[PDB]
Design a protein around this ligand. Sequence first.
Ligand SMILES: *C(=O)CCCCCCCCCCCCCCC
Lengths: 186, 207, 362, 140
Amino acid sequence: SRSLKAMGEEIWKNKTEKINTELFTLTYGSIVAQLCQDYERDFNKVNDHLYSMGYNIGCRLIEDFLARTALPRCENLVKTSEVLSKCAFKIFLNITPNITNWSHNKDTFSLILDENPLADFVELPMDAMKSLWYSNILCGVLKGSLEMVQLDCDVWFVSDILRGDSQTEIKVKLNRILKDEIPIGE
Amino acid sequence: LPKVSQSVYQMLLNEMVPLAMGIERQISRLKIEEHHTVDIIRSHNLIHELYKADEEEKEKVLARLRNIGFQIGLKLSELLIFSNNPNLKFKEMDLLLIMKFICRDVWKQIFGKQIDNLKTNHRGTFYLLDYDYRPIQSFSLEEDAKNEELKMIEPFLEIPVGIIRGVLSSLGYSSEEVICLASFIDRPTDRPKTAFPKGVSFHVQVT
Amino acid sequence: ATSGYRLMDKNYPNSDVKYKFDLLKETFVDETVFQENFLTLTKEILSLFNKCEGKRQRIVDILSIEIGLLYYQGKKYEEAVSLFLSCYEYYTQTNWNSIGLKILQVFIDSLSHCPKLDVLQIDGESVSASAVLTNAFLNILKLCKDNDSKEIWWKKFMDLNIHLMYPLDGLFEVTLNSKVHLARANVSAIEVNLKSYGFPEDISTKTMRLSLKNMGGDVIVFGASDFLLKKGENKLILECRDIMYGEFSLLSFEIIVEGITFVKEFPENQDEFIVVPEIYCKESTKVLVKQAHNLNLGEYALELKSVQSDALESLQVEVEVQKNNMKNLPVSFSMDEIQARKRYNTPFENVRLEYYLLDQIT
Amino acid sequence: LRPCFVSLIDESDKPILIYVPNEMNDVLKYNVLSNISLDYFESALVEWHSLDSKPLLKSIFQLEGVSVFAMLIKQTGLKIVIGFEQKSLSGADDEFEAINQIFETVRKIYIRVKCNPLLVSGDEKSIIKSLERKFDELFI
Ligand SMILES: *C(=O)CCCCCCCCCCCCCCC
């Protein structure tokens, strides 16, 4: 019907309610703050628990995304990349991550977050300078949502601007495209 | 100024009671992330667990969630004061101005609708009355299970209690002379009937 | 600008432009009269400000300390020290660190200069000059954060007595590393670490005691005597000779340096209680109490055994019962009277202690 | 315009931070000036803004050849005090607006640091470090 970029811009313009980014930052920061507080700053497992958060929320969010866009099922990483680059992030967080690091045989790629609205202003302590990610909810959402389009994916963080690296990257390697089910009867 | 889709924000805000139980169960389904197996338990199961867990577990989880809401209010209030700049003073001219500021600004910028009329004893406690309470407009169990429905929602009502408690903090009064309690005693008096049947009331007292 | 006579330390931005401030060359013709002219002006300002109720009080204190510093510059320290007694320590709780450093440094120097300075009074009972001087000294130690250049005050005071407490916090901080474990025959040991970031030099302590309080109320002390604290992070073992077993809550930690005692009283009800278990060692004198093995019907008794008895200079072992009904003593070590205690004094290998059941207790 | 010192004080007269953007004993002079300026707020001598609900800058006094201005945050009780050299001021309206802009930037930095969602509850050392590095980034 239309290009993915045009679809994303059109739906974001006049087909969605809106809320201030700063409030979203405060909410997510308070969540991470409480997680940090009551785990005794054991930052190895807060990552996993935020991953569980992301899986849970994105596994519902995929229904809203598909109900809005009504796209067909994705089949290969080439078109999936186009989708979650140029519509899916635009509808929700109003950003357009770039695609780079195309691995061999088009197996994996990486999302470069030019702007992360989850960390608009953040300064981690020295304890978390090389232990915490603070954005595990994003890749958790990605894994949870892509699980529901019938494709299993391994997604994790490579770098983050908060930790001091040059850019924030999320490798979204695919493991196997699981097939549909069938109801036999014996 | 930049914005985010309201749906994802609402879903994140709702997914705190599942946090509030998952975290506590971790202190006191399985899948491999990349090399190590992490355990995840579904969000809808944890709310049912909170309904039927314990009297002392529930109090701990509610206190934790109130602390979360307190952080929301504490961080949010300074930003609203810098942005909108109300005609308040620090400690106390009158509580009516403070509550008017909360109603006119905080609930605008958190939820999509101004909070409705509020009672006033002029001496002690104030009642903040909201009809249909946006973040639970699509919560239900069954056609017949109505008491179970209401008793299953109550932990979700700690987010605004914490928000109000935080907003009162950093504005004079600390969290020792302020007590706030949410309840479902409100009625749908004459408004059009929405999905959820019962309103929300915040009995908030200061001294 | 025209003369250059410095007033304490306050200097202005040195501008090349000069001012011919010559017509009033009557009140500062010499160097001496200038100081008391400034003092007169400042006193007039102080009197006017002090007649403004209590709505303007900070500038009053600033002007008073300015008067004190001028007195210090004039070398008439007897008035200066008395003037500083009012705000002796005031500018240290409110986080005005440079102000406190300046005022308290000049106070200590003034006290150290004059010959006698035997006795002083601040708001009541006449406090000893040395007793307040050491308080001020120990205050500048924690107040002055300059790492290595605080050694000047240390060298000033070592060459320079009342058993005197202080709030240890701000000088030392201690945390519990690991927990209790047997170290020798009958002494339970616990290792701890204390960081000495306050003082610059090593400390020759005299006694170190860590107190653990039971839920009942009684306490046990883990001791360590004559330990030389090094400048930095150091670990040490605290030994307790007389121990009790069960849950225990930390109470306080005490440093006893020669003349002073630094105490750090912990908060209450932390729910971080540590447990003092029994550790069995083959070479450890102990006494075992239990019901007797061989006995007649209706003839109760106890058996006391002394494992690793061997040679012992002396020992006093006492056994006393507790009442249950909270007003019944359901056992007696005598057929006629009602006793609740036995007191052995001499060494033994095995003895038989009598028993007389009172009513029904099992 | 390079300020001489920047002081932040809360409702309880607790100085958060009196950063000086680095001679040695000028910090004492600036701390004395901040202490003198602290009591100047609650005084009938100066009429504060109390008009249209906007923070208002004021020239509070001149001691030791240091033009020092201050702003009061009515809603929070925060107090900002900023000093300047006499020889660096031309007394122009645009300069007044620039000083107001500097005050606004300092307030924004303070809010951003305070609303950081990793401050535990009240750890003052972290606030001092963060504000100090931010002020180093700005005033340079
Ligand atoms: C083919 O249908 C693939 C569809 C693309 C995957 C769906 C991506 C949805 C999640 C995007 C991230 C939203 C923000 C989450 C953080 C709150």
